[PDB]
Structures are given as C-alpha cells and as structure tokens.
C-alpha cells in the first residue's frame, strides 16, 4: 500500500516530512493518520423578535350651525406578529480542531434544536467559513469573539426564522443546542511547480476510509 | 337644516423590531508586513456588549487590489470604506434589533475585530506575466506560522 | 529544503531577487519569510434607523 | 397574521 495510514499522503511524502509544515509530527508516522477532527461549539444564541409596532395620534376641529363647536383628540398603539415568522435566531459559535492535520476552507453543517426537534440545519457559507484551521487551535482564534450564524441562505441572505410556538417555549427554560453534523475541508499538496494548491483536494474523500481501516483513540 | 365643517390631521409612527436598523461601518485596512497583499477581502466582527451582531466578509465593493507593506486601503489621504452589506452581491443591509438599538442608544459602542483576511500573491507563468489569480495566500499561513519565530 | 521560510518563494527566487518587486528588501533572505499581516482598524459607525 | 390595537380619545364640545 502506497497509503498504509489511508490519508492523502503515501508512505515516503510522510516518514520524509515532506508534507505540509504544519502536520503534527506523530502524524509522519505511516501508522498514524494525518487526519482533522473538527467540532463545533456554540457560546450563546440571540432571538430578534420581529413584530411590529405601530403609534399615532390625531386632532379633530369641528363646528356646526342650525350654532356649535367641538375639538378633540385620540392616540392609537398597535402590534402585529406573524406567527410562522415569529423570530429570528442568530447563534455565536467556534471551531475547534483536535486532530493531527490542519483543516483548510472549514465548512461545518449543524442542526439546531429545540425539544426534540430539529428547526435548522445550516451550512457554513462565505461569512462563516475559516480559511486556516490548525490542531490544537479554534477558529476564530482565542483572544476574538465567536461567528455568528445568522443565514440559512446560499448567499447569505436569508435569516434563521422561528415560530410562534418555538418562540414562546423558548422563552421559558428550554434551550436551544447545536450539534455538528459533519465539517468538509481541504488539505495541501503541492503541485509541479512548489506550489500548495488547497482546492480540489477534499477531506470527505478520506473520512469513511480512514475511519474503516484504523482503531481509534482519543 | 344644519351645516357642518371639520378638519383632522394625524401622524404616526411605526417600527419593526427584528430589523430595527441599519449598521455602516467605515474601515481602512493597514500591512505590516514584507509582502504585498493582492484581492485584499478580510472577515471582520461585529461586537456589541458581549455578543455578536454581525460577521462580514468582504465583497466586491469592499475588496482592495493592491496593499502594499506599510500602506493602507484606502491610500493616505482618502476616506475610509463604507462596509455596508451583508450578504454576497451587495445587496443586502446590516441589520439590528430593537435591544440593540436601545443600548445603541447609549455608551455602548460596536467594536470590529478582523478575524482572517484571504489575499493573493504574484508569480510570473510560462510566458512572462504576473498571475495573481489561484495563488492563495491562506494555503502558506499555518505552514509559514508552524516553522517560525514571531518578532514585532 | 526548497522554502526554507515556508513561503510560496524558493531560496533562489529570494535570494536571487527574481520575485514581486513589490516584496520588502528584508524578506530576500531566505530565513525571513515574505509574509503579509493585513488589519482591518474601523474609523466610525453610522446607524440608519428605518422607521 | 395576528394583530391587537388598542387606544383612547377625549373630546369637548361647546354650544
Ligand atoms: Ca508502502
Ligand atoms: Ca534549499
């Protein structure tokens, strides 16, 4: 076998080094698998309740003849809710890494859930994706404030909505979790000439086959 | 028989309260470092009192070209960027609730954090010209910050 | 080792020069890296309240 | 779409 550890690199490009700089050094054995293990972990979640408010006032002058006079006022306060739109969630989270590989291009999927159902499942697009992603590091780094997840969109655009329902029993001791589902990212090679190329090389191409051929410990 | 004459004027005032208003910020970004930076798009945080209202990436109208060492995007003597939209093609406005707005509204002052930026580096091809285009300079960070010592 | 500072620049490129004209005179050796450290510093906020 | 609104009025007429 070219790969004994089943990882994207072979035997020689990992006993030599001579792979990217910032493997773990336990992972240039070719028994031991240069592979990222990605979590994700939320810090608080933030609910904009969107109803709308609405206020006015009014004056009225009015005079009548057979002679009468009359002035008066008024002021009106209203709101409106819609109740499959009821609120919109935005949760603060981090990305840890506490594998042997660092992770390039990080993009986790995470399902939110709130009483044994699931409201979301959003994948990390271009606001919450982290370019580099080091073993024994977190994405954003330890001395920044967490993401926040606000979209559900493609193109980052649309908000996280929640009903009324969920709405109303998530005002009360119920809590939101998140969970990671899965996290797919990039790792380096270099190509004809010295350069690294992270872009064609996915992470998931490896997953299901380092995890059939190994033992695991943590 | 009778006659009659009236006259009213109302005014009012509504509010949404998930989408209480819009956020700009005005930005410059700075390098200090020995390499120029190419398609400058850094990834910013928007923090208010403890949590987070907001994290930006930079699209095309927020991108700089060109950022030499020890220069800033803007140049010197310009005014900063407005770092106005949210979502992928400018579209799209930065939006708070009604909390934050009333403690806006106040002391409290939104801090901005960069997170990571991405650029481009330069290398000649085949023939003789400078490409900038798949040389990603987020592929040498960690390998750059793993074999080094850091000196400010 | 042909980027003995890890950067996308050989020990020749540097040393020889041949590189971004642009890049520091410091970072032609080849143990310094050439290496950008880009920083966003915001300068005002503007809040548009849409009532 | 759910909706509550309430308010008040005064007035005063003179003959
Ligand atoms: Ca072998
Ligand atoms: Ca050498």
Redesign the pocket.
Known sequence: ????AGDPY???QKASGSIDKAIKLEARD?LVAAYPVVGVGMENLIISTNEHASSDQGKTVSRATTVQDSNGESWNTGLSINKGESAYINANVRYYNTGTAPMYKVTPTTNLVLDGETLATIKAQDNQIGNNLSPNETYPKKGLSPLALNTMDQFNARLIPINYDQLKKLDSGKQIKLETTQVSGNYGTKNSQGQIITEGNSWSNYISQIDSVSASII
Request: aromatic share 12%.
């Open positions: 076998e070219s790969n004994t072979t035997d020689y070719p």
